Design a protein around this ligand. Structure first.
Ligand code: HEM
Ligand code: HEM
Ligand code: HEM
Ligand code: HEM
Ligand code: HEM
Ligand code: HEM
Ligand code: HEM
Ligand code: HEM
Ligand code: HEM
Ligand code: CA
Lengths: 161, 145, 147, 140, 149, 149, 140, 145, 145, 147
């Protein structure tokens, strides 16, 4: 489907606007746009990310925990769930040994199972993890420059169960 | 929390450019906005009985919606030309006075716009700024504050 | 205080948001809004621009000026990928201000603060730090002999 | 005579042609090269900005500064009060040197030749000639 | 009669009409362009000046008119942007018909002219213009708008 | 203070420094280049000539010095090639510090100059040079190497 | 004056520009065409190698032989004893014909113009001018 | 089976260029080599106790390794300039004399290099040639034959 | 990031007054500083073998420490009298030349001072300023930059 | 733009850091450094002090002056707790400058900027705003009739 449209799949495809996925109205013939609206990263949940390509983070850490503090959905706009998250980090050098727990806002779009976590520090670096669609216990987390949308760090996040 | 001044205008005027978009994105952008509005105050559906407000997907209404955003465009697109904006707002003011539209609805419609715009722009979007300007624009249509 | 390549990229983008239209209107209001902040803080500098008629804000003799300033900045940013040339024009840009009697090393550090207060209001997603960093590197070289 | 549309057309095409970042330096360079090969007499006043070696950073800088000014003027075609002023301002920065008024007629010739390549057949020669001309006379 | 302004046709128009709104200063453009378009109309047919009197056409740069310039020019936008949804476009235009019906003085011959003007103007601001496609679509639009006079 | 010679920064440096070793005759280059670099140093600061006396700097083309030319120039290589592994690079450079500490006569001002020279030289052999990136990295290197004098 | 780096720079750029196999013939051709159009007086001495039809194989061959020699000279900029000798050798193969020393000044003009296109803005004009010049005078 | 003459030199000098490589390939190339060396004569680990020879992956050692190959580079890279090579080898010779390094270790280290290089070059690689030259280079560092 | 000029001097000279202090605070202030120094470069302990550098708490060393800060005092305490300072620095310069003290150590010792001073002054303390001046003072002792 | 009691307290402290020693040396260099910034920005004012021999920086006839200025400021600050007296001497301080032909209302706003640029460099923990606020209240009353 086009750039800003959601595919309903099935043996008979139909493109509808992403702004319609999980909105409360049955926009797709088959209904996909409304039958799979479960929020993965919900309050209380924790996700552990294993680095594998880091060209920007200030700590170039081995891991990176992602704790979800709160999550609320606006009663009239179901397509987007707003989140509050603490990004924890365990660094350790020669001259010192730091720990961090930067807090950031963010939303999760049922439209494409992609949670965007707004930049925590004023260094223009934000996290963007897009979900499998069917998994929800593992998502690739790309650290990017919000403005540009440049990828410069990939972490595989696993739901800490 | 902030007033729709010179800069905050330029910002909204620019961001609106991206959120508004064109073609289908538009036909939906408006769609989304109205759905969000009506969802908030179902009471208001009664005012658009003339333009099939019952079915948000009816061409008549689609037109209406796409037609409304149109004005909002002119409004925003001229937040840097008080002279002209003044006029457009005044013009709108007229097309609306007479209809028992409570400040209650405008409020919802603003919220709608804001939520949708935010959904559309992803990350680069100043809330306060829009709030401030959408407000100034609405005031110009009601006459109130 | 080093202008990283990433930072350059950041700016090369941040700019594309302020310098969007090919119509003066926008850039003008911004550069102006920048100066108004310079004058509200270092009122002394105001006098320096009587040559362009700042007493007549909407003059045009002045508006054009604002634009030249804007464009001069634009030219800088749009040079961040060609280092060697930037390094030269950056000098040339200094000389054009050294021969301008009355321009302090301070006024520059002042206009720097200006942008850092204005820009974050005309556009969202402004990496104030990144800007600040590369803007300083640019200013430093411009007013190295200015004080 | 450059009215309202004949300007917007140029303002618009200038955008695509000129470009951004490096794409510009390339433009500037290509331009001046063609100009200097046609009339080497110009390498003279460009002595201050190493006009002998147009690929040099010294000249490169210049090249850009120039195009930039051209950008300004073009971006003022719609507002007369600013253009008239800007143009007058440019005339001064030039008059102070032995500049055969024909040099500009040359500059224009090429600027169009180059935009011709960049823009292709869409290039609105008419609009540019009528419009950039007005900018030159104000400096010639 | 059904091959006028086809999918490809308008898909084209739409694409070409967008070359215009690439820069954020749409207002300055829409205005200037719409301003000129209406002016050049009153030029060829003066009985128009009296119709646009209400919007102070006398002062082209006057906000009163500048606003108008937008409304109209912006309406044309709406028309074009709904080209890919006949029923909607239809409704959208019918509405425009009514907004012109109650404005006495406005006769068909006016639109025919405005059309010719618009067709000579567009290609002056758009480097890529497909006269055939546009004429096809503009016709359908202008007609449906004036179908009440 | 931590934005100096960043990943992109050195990723660049590394890429550009490679434009050099495309042809198998690296020796001829490294030597000639390193030779010139040291020469131009002794040119601006003679008290250097006595330091490199041990390696027969008197005979620029003399194997004694040519070898040296490599060793140094090649050390710079090591530095650059370890830019993407701070701990290793660190160690690698610290080691270079010690190799210079026990060589009396060598003072900081020497490196500062060598840096300026190196920065004026590179862009003469590399068509693609990013002064900003390089200066950022060369600084970090040169500094850590002379941090013992 | 072509020192150590100013050479390596050319030696290197020549590589990318010149190229390999066909890519070369193309270069040679493009070069000579521009040269002959500018100064048709040259079609004269090139009579032996069908200079009238530069696309011909006869001339094509020639074209290549030339560039090749240029390659040699350039690959000797670092070793003076070989260059001085090679250059002297080339001068002989030329002097035997009515060759206006200005022809070479022309050849150079274009060789640079062409490399300019091929290499782009990276093209180190300075280095080449200083360096290729030194190769021409040894033959002029 | 062959002596490191003029040609055999050019060959090794060239092939080495490909095997040595740069960046990470290098940081590994060296890594591999050392692992192969120590695996042969674990006894030798004791000599590099100063530069964390216990953990081949420790930065200190990584440096050391990358640093060693460095010399080997200079050596090979000058097998066509006896004058200069002579010097580099002699220089190395010094940095090594004093340390009780048996011809036993050098042998293993050569083997290591050869096996890794062969693994890296795939098919185009003359064994005898390298053997001959690595030898000539090692001799120049020991003083022996 | 800043040079040890007139003002930046007065600032450091003043702040140093507070951080230095007297009595026990001093005997510790110095203690802390040295511990921070040696912790950074344990290698340097070898230079103070003469004054029990092995045990930072040994009277001999305590003396030494308290004796060192002493000079630093004179230095700082005269950043506003180039004439005199010059002399003191020069005097120190001598007591140090001869000892193989790498710019590496001075660096650590500066860092030490800075960290401790910052710990001692709590909030009112300009880092750049100190860095700049401690530097200028150290330069005057090494001869370098 | 109101000098709060808290602000007064802030200053009554900030001062105790600049006016520490009972030895001229320090206060001098500071007040001087302040004027040097006044002259670099409003060079016209320079002439006004030929009476004290500014052409001879280390004169002493001038140094003493600097001190008097310093001390005059000191006296002000050290009066912030006795309002009524401050309000009077503040006037008396005006009259001493009104009879000084050539002293503009501007030069004062200029020396104000001066401190705000100097002080933050001679001591840390400087509440630039608080200072600015109460300094303006002091200046305003001093040059109410000065222009
Ligand atoms: C800033 C927000 C608003 C703007 C810019 C705006 C703009 C418009 C515009 C341009 C029209 C079409 C006029 C025409 O062409 O005939 C319109 C119609 C109307 N508006 Fe608004 N409007 C706004 C808010 C509201 C609100 C809050 C309500 C009430 C829920 C409302 C109710 C109406 C109604 C009922 C109509 C007429 C429908 C019809 O044509 O039958 N508007 N508005
Ligand atoms: C952000 C850095 C700045 C840039 C990029 C900039 C750019 C320019 C440019 C391009 C000119 C016009 C040269 C010409 O066309 O003749 C100019 C002139 C001048 N600049 Fe700046 N400037 C900067 C900051 C400042 C500051 C901080 C001051 C001090 C208040 C200053 C004072 C002046 C003055 C007074 C002129 C003379 C204008 C006239 O009378 O024509 N500039 N500047
Ligand atoms: C219509 C295109 C032209 C425009 C808009 C223009 C613009 C400029 C600008 C802005 C400068 C830089 C001034 C500065 O910042 O110092 C400049 C300088 C100059 N222009 Fe032009 N120019 C144009 C055509 C010409 C022509 C035809 C000539 C060729 C003879 C010419 C000769 C010069 C010279 C010699 C300088 C000064 C070089 C220096 O800085 O040393 N210009 N021009
Ligand atoms: C395709 C081009 C045209 C479009 C899309 C268009 C659109 C519009 C729009 C949006 C309005 C404003 C309605 C409102 O908001 O109250 C309007 C009004 C009007 N139009 Fe058109 N129009 C077009 C062509 C024409 C032509 C050819 C004439 C010439 C006689 C004309 C005459 C008028 C008049 C007199 C008004 C009244 C404006 C006022 O005083 O408020 N229009 N048109
Ligand atoms: C970043 C550039 C530099 C690098 C990477 C570097 C590298 C080297 C290397 C590898 C050695 C040889 C150690 C050995 O194998 O025994 C060395 C020695 C030396 N370096 Fe540097 N060096 C650099 C800059 C300098 C500077 C600026 C000076 C200038 C005073 C200097 C002076 C010396 C001296 C005198 C020696 C002794 C050579 C001998 O006689 O064996 N180095 N350097
Ligand atoms: C710097 C560039 C030049 C180089 C390196 C060069 C090289 C050569 C070489 C190697 C040959 C082939 C000789 C053979 O194998 O028989 C040749 C032949 C010749 N060159 Fe040049 N040449 C250069 C410039 C010129 C110029 C400027 C002219 C133009 C008038 C020229 C005129 C000739 C002629 C007429 C021949 C003989 C054609 C024939 O074989 O019948 N050359 N040149
Ligand atoms: C042709 C092969 C060899 C070459 C080219 C070579 C080269 C080097 C080089 C350049 C260094 C570093 C010197 C410095 O910068 O301080 C070094 C160090 C050393 N080499 Fe070798 N080496 C070779 C074979 C061996 C062998 C067989 C052994 C023993 C297993 C060995 C033992 C050492 C030791 C222990 C060091 C010093 C480690 C340290 O710095 O603490 N080398 N070698
Ligand atoms: C700005 C910092 C420094 C100052 C002001 C300074 C000052 C002093 C002073 C006053 C003495 C005592 C001289 C005497 O009375 O005999 C001293 C001794 C000495 N300093 Fe420094 N020093 C500084 C940095 C260093 C550094 C970095 C080192 C090396 C880690 C160092 C090593 C020594 C040694 C070993 C002694 C002699 C110990 C002894 O008396 O046996 N100093 N220093
Ligand atoms: C911060 C506020 C200022 C204070 C507290 C201050 C204080 C003083 C004092 C105490 C005197 C000496 C009176 C005497 O002993 O006879 C004085 C004199 C004077 N002040 Fe100010 N002053 C201030 C600002 C200024 C400014 C902004 C100017 C204008 C440039 C200025 C110009 C003068 C001059 C020229 C004199 C005469 C000195 C002489 O010739 O003896 N003062 N001021
Ligand atoms: Ca739906």
């Amino acid at each position: 489907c086009d750039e800003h449209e959601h595919q309903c799949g099935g043996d008979d495809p139909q493109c509808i606007s992403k702004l319609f996925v999980c909105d409360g109205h049955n926009d797709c013939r088959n209904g996909e746009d409304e039958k799979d609206c479960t929020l993965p990263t919900k309050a209380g949940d924790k996700f552990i990310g294993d680095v594998c390509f880091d060209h920007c983070t200030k700590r170039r850490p081995e891991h990176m925990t992602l704790a979800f503090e709160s999550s609320s959905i606006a009663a009239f706009f179901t397509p987007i769930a707003d989140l509050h998250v603490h990004i924890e980090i365990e660094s350790e050098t020669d001259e010192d040994e730091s720990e961090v727990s930067m807090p950031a806002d963010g939303e999760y779009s049922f439209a494409d199972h992609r949670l965007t976590i707004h930049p925590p520090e004023e260094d223009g670096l934000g996290l963007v993890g897009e979900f499998d669609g069917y998994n929800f216990d593992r998502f690739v987390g790309h650290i990017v420059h919000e403005l540009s949308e440049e990828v410069c760090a990939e972490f595989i996040f696993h739901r800490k169960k | 929390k902030k007033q729709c001044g010179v800069l905050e205008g330029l910002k909204v005027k620019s961001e609106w450019g991206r959120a508004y978009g064109s073609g289908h994105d538009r036909e939906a952008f408006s769609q989304a906005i109205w759905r969000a509005t009506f969802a908030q105050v179902p009471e208001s559906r009664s005012l658009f009985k003339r333009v099939h407000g019952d079915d948000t997907s009816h061409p008549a209404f689609i037109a209406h919606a796409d037609r409304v955003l149109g004005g909002l465009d002119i409004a925003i697109s001229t937040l840097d030309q008080p002279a002209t904006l003044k006029e457009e707002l005044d013009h709108l003011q007229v097309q609306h006075e007479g209809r028992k539209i409570p400040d209650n609805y405008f409020d919802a419609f603003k919220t709608a716009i804001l939520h949708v715009v935010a959904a559309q722009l992803g990350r680069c979007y100043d809330r306060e700024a829009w709030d401030a300007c959408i407000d100034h624009i609405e005031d110009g249509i009601k006459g109130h504050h | 205080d080093c202008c990283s390549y990433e930072d350059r990229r950041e700016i090369r983008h941040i700019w594309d948001d302020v310098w969007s239209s090919s119509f003066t209107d926008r850039r003008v209001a911004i550069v102006r809004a920048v100066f108004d902040d310079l004058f509200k803080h270092y009122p002394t500098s105001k006098a320096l621009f009587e040559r362009v008629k700042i007493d007549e804000p909407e003059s045009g003799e002045f508006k054009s000026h604002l634009v030249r300033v804007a464009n001069g900045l634009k030219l800088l940013i749009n040079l961040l990928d060609d280092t060697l040339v930037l390094q030269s024009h950056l000098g040339h840009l200094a000389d054009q201000h050294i021969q301008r009697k009355g321009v302090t090393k301070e006024y520059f550090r002042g206009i720097g603060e200006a942008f850092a207060r204005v820009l974050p209001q005309v556009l969202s997603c402004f990496n104030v730090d990144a800007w600040n960093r590369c803007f300083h590197r640019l200013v430093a070289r411009i007013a190295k002999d200015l004080p | 005579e450059c009215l309202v549309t004949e300007s917007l057309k140029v303002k618009l095409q200038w955008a695509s042609a000129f470009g951004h970042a490096h794409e510009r330096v390339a433009f500037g360079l290509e331009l001046w090269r063609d100009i200097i090969d046609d009339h080497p007499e110009i390498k003279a006043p460009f002595s201050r900005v190493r006009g002998d070696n147009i690929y040099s950073p010294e000249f490169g800088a210049h090249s850009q500064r120039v195009l930039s000014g051209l950008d300004i003027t073009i971006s003022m075609l719609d507002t007369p009060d600013m253009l008239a002023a800007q143009l007058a301002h440019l005339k001064v920065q030039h008059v102070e040197r032995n500049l055969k008024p024909e040099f500009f007629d040359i500059f224009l010739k090429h600027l169009l030749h180059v935009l011709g390549d960049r823009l292709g057949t869409h290039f609105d020669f008419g609009a540019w000639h009528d419009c950039v001309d007005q900018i030159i006379d104000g400096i010639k | 009669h059904e091959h006028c302004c086809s999918e490809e046709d308008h898909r084209i128009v739409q694409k070409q009409w967008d070359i215009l709104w690439r820069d954020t200063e749409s207002s300055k453009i829409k205005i200037g362009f719409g301003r000129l378009l209406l002016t050049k109309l009153a030029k060829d047919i003066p009985e128009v000046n009296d119709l646009f009197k209400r919007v102070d056409i006398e002062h082209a740069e006057g906000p009163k008119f500048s606003a108008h310039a937008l409304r109209i020019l912006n309406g044309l936008d709406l028309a074009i942007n709904l080209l890919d949804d006949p029923p909607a476009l239809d409704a959208a235009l019918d509405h425009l018909a009514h907004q012109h019906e109650v404005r006495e003085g406005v006769q068909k011959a006016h639109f025919k002219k405005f059309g010719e003007i618009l067709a000579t103007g567009l290609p002056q601001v758009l480097d890529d213009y497909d006269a055939l496609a546009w004429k096809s679509c503009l016709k359908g639009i202008l007609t449906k708008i004036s179908s009440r006079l």
